[PDB]
Amino acid sequence: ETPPRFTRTPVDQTGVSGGVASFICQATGDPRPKIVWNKKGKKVSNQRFEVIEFDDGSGSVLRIQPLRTPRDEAIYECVASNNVGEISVSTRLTVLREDQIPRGFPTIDMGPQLKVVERTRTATMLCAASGNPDPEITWFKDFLPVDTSNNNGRIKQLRSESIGGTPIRGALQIEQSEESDQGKYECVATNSAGTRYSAPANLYVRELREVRRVPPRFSIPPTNHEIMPGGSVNITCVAVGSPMPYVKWMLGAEDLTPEDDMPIGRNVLELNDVRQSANYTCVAMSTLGVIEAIAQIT
Amino acid sequence: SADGCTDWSIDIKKYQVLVGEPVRIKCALFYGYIRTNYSLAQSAGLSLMWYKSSGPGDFEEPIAFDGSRMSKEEDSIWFRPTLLQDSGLYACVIRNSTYCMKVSISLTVGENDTGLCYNSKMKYFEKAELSKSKEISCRDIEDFLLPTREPEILWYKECRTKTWRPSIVFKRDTLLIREVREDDIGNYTCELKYGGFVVRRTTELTVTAPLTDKPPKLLYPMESKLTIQETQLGDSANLTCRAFFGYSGDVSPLIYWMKGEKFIEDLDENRVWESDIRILKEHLGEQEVSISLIVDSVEEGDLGNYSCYVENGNGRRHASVLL
Ligand SMILES: *[C@@H]1O[C@H](CO)[C@@H](O[C@@H]2O[C@H](CO)[C@@H](O[C@@H]3O[C@H](CO)[C@@H](O)[C@H](O[C@H]4O[C@H](CO)[C@@H](O)[C@H](O)[C@@H]4O)[C@@H]3O)[C@H](O)[C@H]2NC(C)=O)[C@H](O)[C@H]1NC(C)=O
Ligand SMILES: *[C@@H]1O[C@H](CO)[C@@H](O[C@@H]2O[C@H](CO)[C@@H](O)[C@H](O)[C@H]2NC(C)=O)[C@H](O)[C@H]1NC(C)=O
Ligand SMILES: *[C@@H]1O[C@H](CO)[C@@H](O[C@@H]2O[C@H](CO)[C@@H](O)[C@H](O)[C@H]2NC(C)=O)[C@H](O)[C@H]1NC(C)=O
Ligand SMILES: *[C@@H]1O[C@H](CO)[C@@H](O[C@@H]2O[C@H](CO)[C@@H](O)[C@H](O)[C@H]2NC(C)=O)[C@H](O)[C@H]1NC(C)=O
Ligand SMILES: *[C@@H]1O[C@H](CO)[C@@H](O)[C@H](O[C@@H]2O[C@@H](C)[C@@H](O)[C@@H](O)[C@@H]2O)[C@H]1NC(C)=O
Ligand SMILES: *[C@@H]1O[C@H](CO)[C@@H](O)[C@H](O)[C@H]1NC(C)=O
Ligand SMILES: *[C@@H]1O[C@H](CO)[C@@H](O)[C@H](O)[C@H]1NC(C)=O
Ligand SMILES: [Zn+2]
Ligand SMILES: [Zn+2]
Ligand SMILES: [Zn+2]
């Protein structure tokens, strides 16, 4: 048997009226501790306050769904209670005056929009936020924060890499979508001045569907031809797929077809005045994949 | 990844232009998602391909450019002029053998509404305060502006040519009002000629009263007086709070109830609750609102002083009634 040990401690924060406020408090111990939230020293009991526990069993989240500012502008306490000991921690919740907000408060330029996705296919949610100190994007799923400690699994986080003067984009990408991912999704922009929440967006996972897209394959691969220095040759390379791939001719690591008129599906390399042996390669690329096949001229 | 690209769903920037207008859409990847020149991804061995789908969920297809109407230049696509058929989603994709990233750019081409010089769906929106200055600019015309040339822009109010008062400056691509009036609400259409094609941008201006230096006004209950209302224990009791709110920013007004010191959230149960901030009247951004406190079933403990509180950045006011 062990006393409670805090693994995650809530942090002070500043919200906005009508927004939401989420405090996280995780603790480990044997037996599993029980978490209790106190507002102004008073255990919370309210329609506006929802206490959602992790499926880990260790830890809980206090959610203030509407913020009223004078009411609930206060100091809150997370108390982890064990069979053998009690440990407590405290935080400050400032609900800022919706009239007065600092210039660089984090704002949601664009939230996540509702999405419906096939089973076992990657579903991605986008968020765009900005502030005078460039914010940090976190994600809450069904009132609980989404944890990707590192990119070990399917639910990866994508971060924009802007150079400045642009909104920041954070994306929640779900690879190999299980059935259990559907529900409310909220993007949170955290900043030193305050934190702001995006409007919720439901993810709906539905029926598996037919394979519409097929990766590119060579229908007519380039054929080897052996014409000697006098002659001229036309080499045809045709690749197909769904979508149809762009097909370009390369010699080694040099691009031979221009980037503005790259043809679709079929590219014919016309060679005049050839004199020396070459290893030309036809590259057929699409959004699904890239493939390359080599024709040798001797 | 080799098997699957990293899709950035759609970009925040949307292009919406009238048909017959030249427009240039550029890859959002270089301008917000990754830090790289276009010609710097090309040097590193990455290729730039464009796809087009008619809708957000519909299938993507390759594009073949002709160079005259639809020309692919650097990291952008040029439409000279756009056609109604050009609407849809244009996916910017950069990839090599192992890397792949893509994002979708929305492009909408439409006709202007019947009898007007703009499409109501495609408008800019700006706010302004009375007695103060407001500058409206013709936005998103960088590609048409020469720093050494005057754009010769015409401005219309309500799709009609009007005579503008000398208080409005009209310098280069901007219209500046030195002192705004409620008369100044409306739709401003900016029209610029470029290469024989007319480009337009339309802004709708909303006008409000200036930011208040005064606190809210308590109508009922009156402050500095105690109004009495007591009822039977069996029937319900309703208490309304009417307040006037000057324009302190387009925002939800701070009007709430308080019983002595409690916030009507502690012992409410299903018995006491607030009225949900009905908005009685408003004009020029000033709102007359009301919130009532209701005791549905009366008890002896409900009796006592109930105080309505009203607050903005300039101050607050409380007034109380008795049950
Ligand atoms: C958005 O709405 C506006 C409506 O205001 C529309 O553009 C406007 O009307 C027409 C468009 O065809 C253009 O005005 C032209 O003015 C020139 C002189 O500058 C005239 O020569 C033109 O008249 C010709 O057509 C007449 C039709 O019967 C003939 O009788 C006449 O002899 C001429 O051949 C023409 O009227 C101009 O583009 C504006 N004008 C003004 C005043 O704003 C626009 O087309 C709409 N957008 C779209 C995408 O349709
Ligand atoms: C394809 O492009 C990507 C992105 O430019 C290349 O990945 C970079 O490669 C080197 C070392 O691997 C570094 O510049 C970065 O650490 C890599 N970035 C990422 C995101 O992987 C990749 O090498 C390119 N592949 C080919 C074959 O050219
Ligand atoms: C500015 O343009 C809008 C339309 O783009 C006008 O809005 C219309 O106004 C009247 C009543 O308000 C009706 O014709 C429609 O119900 C409105 N349409 C829309 C889309 O709101 C508006 O009146 C114009 N402003 C001025 C001052 O004329
Ligand atoms: C309680 O009584 C008040 C006053 O009669 C109600 O407020 C009015 O409600 C009517 C009908 O919804 C509106 O037409 C008026 O504009 C309201 N006046 C104000 C100033 O709010 C209130 O709706 C009642 N609430 C309940 C549910 O009992
Ligand atoms: C390569 O393609 C071009 C265009 O389709 C053809 O014109 C070439 O063949 C022609 O054949 C001779 C008889 C003459 O008409 C001349 O114009 C071309 O060389 C073709 N070259 C091949 C297949 O070697
Ligand atoms: C073509 O490629 C093969 C294998 O990479 C190589 O052995 C051969 O020498 C090349 N020929 C020329 C002319 O580069
Ligand atoms: C981007 O391109 C310019 C030339 O157009 C170059 O001078 C500059 O160094 C590039 N930016 C880099 C390498 O960060
Ligand atoms: Zn008025
Ligand atoms: Zn008037
Ligand atoms: Zn007082």
Numbering used by the authors:
A (entry chain A): 21 to 318
B (entry chain B): 27 to 349
Manuscript text:
The leukocyte common antigen-related receptor protein tyrosine phosphatases (LAR-RPTPs), including LAR, PTPσ and PTPδ in vertebrates, and dLAR in Drosophila, have recently emerged as a major family of synaptic adhesion molecules. Presynaptic LAR-RPTPs induce synaptic differentiation by binding several postsynaptic partners, including members of the Slit- and Trk-like family of proteins (Slitrks), interleukin-1 receptor accessory protein (IL-1RAcP), IL-1 receptor accessory protein-like 1 (IL1RAPL1), neurotrophin receptor tyrosine kinase C (TrkC), netrin-G ligand-3 (NGL-3), synaptic adhesion-like molecule 3 (SALM3) and synaptic adhesion-like molecule 5. LAR-RPTPs contain multiple splice sites—designated mini-exons A-D (MeA-D), that produce diverse LAR-RPTP variants with and without short peptide inserts. Recent progress in the structural characterization of trans-synaptic adhesion complexes, including LAR-RPTPs bound to Slitrks, TrkC, IL1RAPL1 or IL-1RAcP, have revealed the interaction interface of these complexes as well as the significant role of splice inserts, particularly that of MeA and MeB, in their selective binding.
Here, we determined the crystal structure of the human LAR-RPTP (PTPδ)/IL1RAPL1 complex and identified the lateral molecular interactions between neighboring LAR-RPTP (PTPδ)/IL1RAPL1 complexes in the crystal-packing lattices. Notably, these interactions were found to be essential for the formation of higher-order trans-synaptic adhesion complex assemblies (PTPδ/IL1RAPL1 complexes) and for IL1RAPL1-mediated presynaptic differentiation. Likewise, the binding of LAR-RPTPs to other postsynaptic adhesion molecules—Slitrk3 and IL-1RAcP (but not TrkC)—induces the formation of higher-order trans-synaptic adhesion complex assemblies. We also provide compelling evidence that HSPG, but not CSPG, inhibits the interactions of LAR-RPTPs with their postsynaptic ligands (Slitrk1, IL1RAPL1 and IL-1RAcP) and that HSPGs can even disrupt pre-established LAR-RPTP-mediated trans-synaptic adhesion complexes. Our results suggest that the competitive advantage of HSPGs over postsynaptic adhesion partners for LAR-RPTP binding can modulate LAR-RPTP-mediated synaptogenesis.
